[PDB]
Design an enzyme around this catalytic site. Structure first.
Site, PDB file in Angstrom:
ATOM      1  N   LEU A   1       0.822  -1.216   0.000  1.00 21.17           N
ATOM      2  CA  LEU A   1       0.000   0.000   0.000  1.00 21.17           C
ATOM      3  C   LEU A   1       0.860   1.271   0.000  1.00 21.17           C
ATOM      4  CD1 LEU A   1      -2.887  -0.942   2.453  1.00 21.17           C
ATOM      5  CD2 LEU A   1      -2.710  -1.406  -0.017  1.00 21.17           C
TER       6      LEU A   1
ATOM      7  N   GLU B   1      -8.899   0.827   9.663  1.00 18.61           N
ATOM      8  CA  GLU B   1      -9.287   0.727   8.247  1.00 18.61           C
ATOM      9  C   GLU B   1      -9.197  -0.732   7.762  1.00 18.61           C
ATOM     10  OE1 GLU B   1      -8.326   0.428   4.761  1.00 18.61           O
ATOM     11  OE2 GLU B   1     -10.397   1.123   4.346  1.00 18.61           O
TER      12      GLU B   1
HETATM   13  N1  NDP Z   1      -5.550   0.056  -1.752  1.00 20.17           N
HETATM   14  C1  NDP Z   1      -6.275  -1.042  -2.026  1.00 20.17           C
HETATM   15  O1  NDP Z   1      -7.619  -1.120  -1.736  1.00 20.17           O
HETATM   16  C2  NDP Z   1      -5.673  -2.245  -2.699  1.00 20.17           C
HETATM   17  C3  NDP Z   1      -4.358  -2.232  -3.080  1.00 20.17           C
HETATM   18  N2  NDP Z   1      -3.793  -3.254  -3.779  1.00 20.17           N
HETATM   19  C4  NDP Z   1      -2.464  -3.021  -4.314  1.00 20.17           C
HETATM   20  O2  NDP Z   1      -2.485  -3.079  -5.735  1.00 20.17           O
HETATM   21  C5  NDP Z   1      -1.333  -3.766  -6.179  1.00 20.17           C
HETATM   22  C6  NDP Z   1      -1.778  -5.051  -6.869  1.00 20.17           C
HETATM   23  O3  NDP Z   1      -2.683  -4.744  -7.915  1.00 20.17           O
HETATM   24  P1  NDP Z   1      -2.410  -4.901  -9.492  1.00 20.17           P
HETATM   25  O4  NDP Z   1      -0.992  -4.550  -9.785  1.00 20.17           O
HETATM   26  O5  NDP Z   1      -3.506  -4.175 -10.170  1.00 20.17           O
HETATM   27  O6  NDP Z   1      -2.527  -6.481  -9.837  1.00 20.17           O
HETATM   28  P2  NDP Z   1      -3.639  -7.626  -9.710  1.00 20.17           P
HETATM   29  O7  NDP Z   1      -3.913  -8.073  -8.338  1.00 20.17           O
HETATM   30  O8  NDP Z   1      -4.816  -7.300 -10.513  1.00 20.17           O
HETATM   31  O9  NDP Z   1      -2.830  -8.858 -10.376  1.00 20.17           O
HETATM   32  C7  NDP Z   1      -2.424  -8.935 -11.738  1.00 20.17           C
HETATM   33  C8  NDP Z   1      -2.483 -10.388 -12.238  1.00 20.17           C
HETATM   34  O10 NDP Z   1      -3.717 -10.993 -11.858  1.00 20.17           O
HETATM   35  C9  NDP Z   1      -4.238 -11.775 -12.907  1.00 20.17           C
HETATM   36  N3  NDP Z   1      -5.486 -11.148 -13.359  1.00 20.17           N
HETATM   37  C10 NDP Z   1      -5.955  -9.872 -13.119  1.00 20.17           C
HETATM   38  N4  NDP Z   1      -7.187  -9.759 -13.695  1.00 20.17           N
HETATM   39  C11 NDP Z   1      -7.493 -10.940 -14.295  1.00 20.17           C
HETATM   40  C12 NDP Z   1      -8.589 -11.412 -15.022  1.00 20.17           C
HETATM   41  N5  NDP Z   1      -9.634 -10.648 -15.325  1.00 20.17           N
HETATM   42  N6  NDP Z   1      -8.594 -12.703 -15.481  1.00 20.17           N
HETATM   43  C13 NDP Z   1      -7.535 -13.548 -15.254  1.00 20.17           C
HETATM   44  N7  NDP Z   1      -6.445 -13.097 -14.542  1.00 20.17           N
HETATM   45  C14 NDP Z   1      -6.436 -11.821 -14.074  1.00 20.17           C
HETATM   46  C15 NDP Z   1      -3.140 -11.865 -13.956  1.00 20.17           C
HETATM   47  O11 NDP Z   1      -2.285 -12.934 -13.595  1.00 20.17           O
HETATM   48  P3  NDP Z   1      -1.492 -13.855 -14.634  1.00 20.17           P
HETATM   49  O12 NDP Z   1      -0.360 -13.011 -15.158  1.00 20.17           O
HETATM   50  O13 NDP Z   1      -0.952 -15.087 -13.938  1.00 20.17           O
HETATM   51  O14 NDP Z   1      -2.469 -14.227 -15.701  1.00 20.17           O
HETATM   52  C16 NDP Z   1      -2.457 -10.535 -13.760  1.00 20.17           C
HETATM   53  O15 NDP Z   1      -1.150 -10.481 -14.300  1.00 20.17           O
HETATM   54  C17 NDP Z   1      -0.439  -3.962  -4.954  1.00 20.17           C
HETATM   55  O16 NDP Z   1       0.430  -2.841  -4.747  1.00 20.17           O
HETATM   56  C18 NDP Z   1      -1.447  -4.044  -3.826  1.00 20.17           C
HETATM   57  O17 NDP Z   1      -0.821  -3.768  -2.590  1.00 20.17           O
HETATM   58  C19 NDP Z   1      -4.516  -4.286  -4.287  1.00 20.17           C
HETATM   59  C20 NDP Z   1      -5.868  -4.330  -4.070  1.00 20.17           C
HETATM   60  C21 NDP Z   1      -6.597  -3.247  -3.338  1.00 20.17           C
HETATM   61  N1  FOL Z   2     -10.958  -0.645   2.292  1.00 20.51           N
HETATM   62  C1  FOL Z   2      -9.856  -1.358   1.942  1.00 20.51           C
HETATM   63  N2  FOL Z   2      -8.624  -1.235   2.579  1.00 20.51           N
HETATM   64  C2  FOL Z   2      -7.531  -1.994   2.189  1.00 20.51           C
HETATM   65  O1  FOL Z   2      -6.424  -1.885   2.753  1.00 20.51           O
HETATM   66  C3  FOL Z   2      -7.702  -2.904   1.152  1.00 20.51           C
HETATM   67  N3  FOL Z   2      -6.639  -3.704   0.740  1.00 20.51           N
HETATM   68  C4  FOL Z   2      -6.808  -4.605  -0.294  1.00 20.51           C
HETATM   69  C5  FOL Z   2      -5.684  -5.510  -0.748  1.00 20.51           C
HETATM   70  N4  FOL Z   2      -4.655  -5.747   0.270  1.00 20.51           N
HETATM   71  C6  FOL Z   2      -4.819  -6.469   1.403  1.00 20.51           C
HETATM   72  C7  FOL Z   2      -3.695  -6.660   2.219  1.00 20.51           C
HETATM   73  C8  FOL Z   2      -3.762  -7.383   3.420  1.00 20.51           C
HETATM   74  C9  FOL Z   2      -4.992  -7.900   3.829  1.00 20.51           C
HETATM   75  C10 FOL Z   2      -5.140  -8.677   5.108  1.00 20.51           C
HETATM   76  O2  FOL Z   2      -4.050  -9.326   5.705  1.00 20.51           O
HETATM   77  N5  FOL Z   2      -6.352  -8.709   5.679  1.00 20.51           N
HETATM   78  C11 FOL Z   2      -6.618  -9.479   6.893  1.00 20.51           C
HETATM   79  C12 FOL Z   2      -6.230  -8.805   8.189  1.00 20.51           C
HETATM   80  C13 FOL Z   2      -6.801  -7.418   8.357  1.00 20.51           C
HETATM   81  C14 FOL Z   2      -6.235  -6.860   9.637  1.00 20.51           C
HETATM   82  O3  FOL Z   2      -5.007  -6.760   9.761  1.00 20.51           O
HETATM   83  O4  FOL Z   2      -6.953  -6.506  10.590  1.00 20.51           O
HETATM   84  C15 FOL Z   2      -8.056  -9.872   6.984  1.00 20.51           C
HETATM   85  O5  FOL Z   2      -8.341 -10.748   7.853  1.00 20.51           O
HETATM   86  O6  FOL Z   2      -8.926  -9.328   6.230  1.00 20.51           O
HETATM   87  C16 FOL Z   2      -6.104  -7.734   3.011  1.00 20.51           C
HETATM   88  C17 FOL Z   2      -6.026  -7.017   1.822  1.00 20.51           C
HETATM   89  C18 FOL Z   2      -8.065  -4.716  -0.916  1.00 20.51           C
HETATM   90  N6  FOL Z   2      -9.118  -3.907  -0.532  1.00 20.51           N
HETATM   91  C19 FOL Z   2      -8.941  -3.015   0.516  1.00 20.51           C
HETATM   92  N7  FOL Z   2      -9.997  -2.221   0.900  1.00 20.51           N
END
Ligand code: NDP
Ligand code: FOL
Length: 186
Positions: free
Chosen positions: A22, A30
């Protein structure tokens, strides 16, 4: 599946990730909100399903995988089988939802939650029918390399409040943020 939920936290500059983690320091309450929303089901005998991309899976600390109390499904076009600890693997979002109505899962899934990353959110947010977006607005700029797609207000309404979601500005570790809920019906 008649409804989907997406959940995300985003900075003012629309950032969601940096260097496989993140962009901001850990915000404990959060994270507890993400856990409470993705895990909670009052339907006896069922669990919620979390759907995520491969990079998002590997971004979860290993000791916390699979996410406890939830069925964990990873999307990948390359993998032969789910990554170690994951329950299921699908080649697309369409395939994932279809899997929920096969015998193994028929009697098992309550709510479906999309937990990222960018590509997974983009496709879910265009999916037909009812969908809610639970967006945490982190009220500061943070250097990022992964971003959340734009929310189209032609389709989505920002709801004035939502049962079980706090309305006021929150603060942890000196960082302000607020919980928002968006909805589309068609
Ligand atoms: N702030 C937040 O709420 C969240 C933050 N994060 C952050 O985002 C980053 C990760 O996200 P991001 O880089 O977008 O990558 P993704 O988690 O989307 O992963 C990418 C890989 O997932 C697979 N993939 C994604 N979409 C599809 C699909 N529709 N069908 C089949 N395979 C799929 C592919 O794998 P393959 O190459 O094997 O086919 C692709 O290369 C991290 O930094 C993480 O910490 C992530 C989620 C939420
Ligand atoms: N609202 C929101 N905040 C986020 O940080 C977030 N992060 C992701 C992707 N990243 C992550 C990273 C770690 C964990 C995780 O370890 N979750 C545990 C523990 C949470 C805690 O520490 O209390 C879980 O049990 O959900 C989940 C998502 C996707 N959607 C989000 N959505």
């Amino acid at each position: 599946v008649g409804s989907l939920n997406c959940i995300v936290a985003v900075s003012q500059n629309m950032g969601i990730g940096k260097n496989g983690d993140l962009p901001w320091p850990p915000l404990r309450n959060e994270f507890r909100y993400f856990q409470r929303m993705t895990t909670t089901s009052s339907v006896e005998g069922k669990q919620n399903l979390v759907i995520m991309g491969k990079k998002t899976w590997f971004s979860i600390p290993e000791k916390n995988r699979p996410l406890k109390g939830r069925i964990n499904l990873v999307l990948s076009r390359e993998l032969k089988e789910p990554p170690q600890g994951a329950h299921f693997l699908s080649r697309s979002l369409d395939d994932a939802l279809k899997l929920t109505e096969q015998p193994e899962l028929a009697n098992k899934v309550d709510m479906v939650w999309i937990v990222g990353g960018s590509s997974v959110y983009k496709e879910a947010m265009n999916h037909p029918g009812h969908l809610k977006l639970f967006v945490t607005r982190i009220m500061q700029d943070f250097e990022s390399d992964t971003f959340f797609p734009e929310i189209d207000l032609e389709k989505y309404k920002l709801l004035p409040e939502y049962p079980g979601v706090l309305s006021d500005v929150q603060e942890e570790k000196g960082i302000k943020y607020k919980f928002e809920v968006y909805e589309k019906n068609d």
